[PDB]
Design a protein around this ligand. Structure first.
Ligand SMILES: Nc1ncnc2c1ncn2[C@@H]1O[C@H](COP(=O)(O)OP(=O)(O)O)[C@@H](O)[C@H]1O
Ligand SMILES: Nc1ncnc2c1ncn2[C@@H]1O[C@H](COP(=O)(O)OP(=O)(O)O)[C@@H](O)[C@H]1O
Ligand SMILES: N[C@@H]1CON=C1OP(=O)(O)O
Ligand SMILES: N[C@@H]1CON=C1OP(=O)(O)O
Ligand SMILES: [Mg+2]
Ligand SMILES: [Mg+2]
Ligand SMILES: [Mg+2]
Ligand SMILES: [Mg+2]
Lengths: 8, 306, 304
C-alpha cells in the first residue's frame, strides 16, 4: 500500500 | 511497516458534523506525532472490514450512538483491534444518562433531582403520581433525551403548559427521556487522561444553556481555564469527577460535566467517553493548560489504548 | 431463515454452555427452525453473515457471549440476536454495577463492600475493614463478573476473608463481599412482557454452588415456588422493576433470596440463562404451559 509514512 | 491507525469519524448520529470536525483534527494531530493514521467514516465504509483493510489500532473520534455506546467497542473487541477510550460496559453506561444517574445515586454521588419517562408512558398519558413528582422539581426544568450528546433534543421549560412540547422534542431522539431540576450553575467540565485529572474549565454560554449553538457556532461563549475556583473547591471537583469516572468503569480518557446549584454543591450531569476533539474543543483546552499541544494529546490517548 | 446457535466459547462456564446449546438446537429443530450449532472457540464468529445465517440464538454463558461484546459485533454485522442489547448485557454481567443501579433505583439489595485487586494487593484500610465488619458474619465472597457460582466462597471467620479474596481475585479484578442471606432462594424467568412462575431452589450443601447446579441429583426445585399469594405477587413485581431498571429485553432469569427479615433481595440478572434441563428457565416455561421447543421458538421470535 501507498502510505503517508513510506517504509516502517 | 509500523502500525496503521484508523481514525473513525463522521458516522450516522446526530453528532456526525461535530465528529467530522473531531476526526479532521485528530487525523492531522496523529500524523504530526509520527503516527500512520487514516480517516475511515463508518457511514461510507463497512467497519467490520477494518482488520481486512490492514489496520492495527483504532482511534475513535465518533460521537453518539453507533460509536460511543459500546456497540463499536464490542465489534472491535471481537475483531481483536485495540481502540481508544472506554470499553463496552462503561461506554454503554456513559451514553445512557438515566442509568449513569442511577449508578451514581447508588454510589452516593450528587445528581440533580429528576424524573424519567419512557415513550410508552408519555403516550399512555402521565399519571397523577407522575405529574406530582414532576411538579416537585419546580420550574424551570431541563428536558433531555437519555442517549444523546451535543445538547441535541434538549430544551428548557419555563411554563407548565410547555412541558409537553419539550417532551415531544426529546422523544424525537430517544425512547427514554429525563426531566431534571434546573441547576443555577456555574457550569464546569473536567477532562480525564489516563490516571490524570486535567484542569477544570468554567463554561459561560451567552444564552440560556450550553446548547448546540453555544458549543459549536457562537463566538460569544466564554471559557475559563483555569476555572477560577479556590484551591480546595478545585480539589473537591477533581475528587468528585474521579469517583464518578471510576464508578462507571471508564478508562483511557473522557470528559465529565458538572454544575453548581444554589446550595453551593456540585452535581454530576453526565460522562462523555468520546469527547469533542475539534481544535477548539474542551479536552484540548484543558490539555493545553496542562502543558500539552493537540498532537501530544492525541498521541497520549492512542498510547493508552489496549 | 437460517439460524446460528452459539455454544461453548472460552469462559469458565463453557461446559454448561455446550449443554445449553445442545438442548436449544434440538428444541429449535423440533420447532421446524433451520438451526445449526456454532462454537466461537472453533469458528470465527465475525464470519457469521458471510457463513450464511440471518439470525442468532445466543446460548453462551459468561464474558464474551453474555457481556455485550458479542451483541455489539452482531449489531454492526446487522444480524438479529436473542436477548438483551449491549448495555443491559454488559450491566447484568457486572454484579457491582447491577447492585449500584438497583440501589440507586431504591430496590432491595444485600449490604455489601466492593474491592479492587489494587486495593487488595496493597492491603485494606481501616475504613474498609470497618465497612466489612458491619456486614456481620457470615459473608459471601464473589467475583463481580462470573456465573454458575464460579469463584465463590462462604466465610465464617474474620481471619479467613483474605484467603477467600485470593480465590475470587483469580477470576476478576473486582470482588464483592456481601452479607449472607438466610434464604430461601428463588429464581424468576422473564419472557417478553411475561413474568413466568417463580422457582424455589433448595441445595443440599452450603449454597447453590456449581456442583449443586449441574452435577448433583440432590438439589430440590419447586415450581410453583410455594409462596403465599401476596409474597408471590411481591416477588413478581420486584423482578419486573429489576428487569426494567437494567434495561433488559427478550428473556432472562433474575435471582432473588429472602433474608432473616422476611424480605426479598436481588442477587443478579442473567441475560443468557442455562438451557439444559437441569436448567431453570425451561422448567418455568413448562409450568406456564410451554414445551421446551415452544420456549426457544418464542425467544427467537422477539428479536430486533
Ligand atoms: N439540570 C440542569 N440544569 C441546568 N442546565 C443543565 C442541566 N443539565 C444540563 N444542563 C445544560 O445542558 C447542557 C447539556 O447537558 P448534558 O447533560 O451535558 O448533555 P449532552 O450529552 O447533550 O452534553 C449542559 O452543558 C448544561 O449547559
Ligand atoms: N448474599 C448471599 N447470601 C447467601 N447466598 C448467596 C449470596 N449471594 C450468592 N449466594 C449463593 O451463591 C449462588 C450464586 O450467586 P449469584 O449471585 O447468583 O452468582 P452466579 O452468577 O455465580 O449465579 C446463589 O444462587 C446463592 O446460592
Ligand atoms: N458529545 C459531544 C461531542 O463531543 N463532546 C461532547 O460533549 P457533550 O456535548 O455531550 O457534553
Ligand atoms: N450463568 C449461568 C449459566 O446459566 N444460567 C446461569 O445462572 P447463574 O448460575 O449465573 O445464576
Ligand atoms: Mg454528552
Ligand atoms: Mg454535556
Ligand atoms: Mg449469574
Ligand atoms: Mg445466580
Amino acid at each position: 500500500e501507498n502510505l503517508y509514512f513510506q517504509g516502517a | 511497516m509500523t502500525d496503521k491507525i484508523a481514525v473513525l469519524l463522521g458516522g450516522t448520529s446526530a453528532e456526525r458534523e461535530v465528529s467530522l470536525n473531531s476526526g479532521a483534527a485528530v487525523l492531522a494531530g496523529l500524523r504530526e506525532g509520527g503516527i500512520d493514521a487514516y480517516p475511515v467514516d463508518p457511514k461510507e465504509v463497512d467497519v467490520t472490514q477494518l482488520k481486512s483493510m490492514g489496520f492495527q489500532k483504532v482511534f475513535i473520534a465518533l460521537h453518539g450512538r453507533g460509536g460511543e455506546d459500546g456497540t463499536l467497542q464490542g465489534m472491535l473487541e471481537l475483531m481483536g483491534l485495540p481502540y481508544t477510550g472506554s470499553g463496552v460496559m462503561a461506554s454503554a453506561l456513559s451514553m445512557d444518562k438515566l442509568r449513569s444517574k442511577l449508578l451514581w445515586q447508588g454510589a452516593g454521588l450528587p445528581v440533580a433531582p429528576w424524573v424519567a419517562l419512557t415513550r410508552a408512558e408519555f403516550e399512555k398519558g402521565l399519571s397523577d403520581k407522575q405529574l406530582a413528582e414532576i411538579s416537585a422539581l419546580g420550574l424551570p426544568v431541563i428536558v433531555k433525551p437519555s442517549r444523546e450528546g451535543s445538547s441535541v433534543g434538549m430544551s428548557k421549560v419555563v411554563a407548565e403548559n410547555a412541558l409537553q412540547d419539550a417532551l415531544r422534542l426529546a422523544f424525537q431522539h430517544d425512547e427514554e427521556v429525563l426531566i431534571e431540576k434546573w441547576l443555577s450553575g456555574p457550569e464546569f467540565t473536567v477532562a480525564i487522561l489516563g490516571e490524570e485529572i486535567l484542569p477544570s474549565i468554567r463554561i459561560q454560554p451567552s444564552g440560556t444553556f450550553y446548547d448546540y449553538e453555544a458549543k459549536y457556532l457562537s463566538d460569544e461563549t466564554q471559557y475559563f481555564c483555569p476555572a477560577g475556583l479556590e484551591a480546595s473547591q478545585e480539589a473537591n471537583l477533581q475528587a468528585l469527577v474521579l469517583k464518578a469516572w471510576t464508578t462507571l468503569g471508564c478508562k483511557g480518557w473522557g470528559r465529565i460535566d458538572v454544575m453548581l446549584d444554589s446550595d453551593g454543591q456540585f452535581y454530576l450531569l453526565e460522562a462523555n467517553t468520546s469527547p469533542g476533539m475539534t481544535s477548539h474543543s474542551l479536552v484540548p483546552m484543558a490539555a493545553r493548560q496542562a502543558g500539552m499541544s493537540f498532537s501530544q494529546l492525541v498521541v497520549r490517548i492512542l498510547e493508552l489504548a489496549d
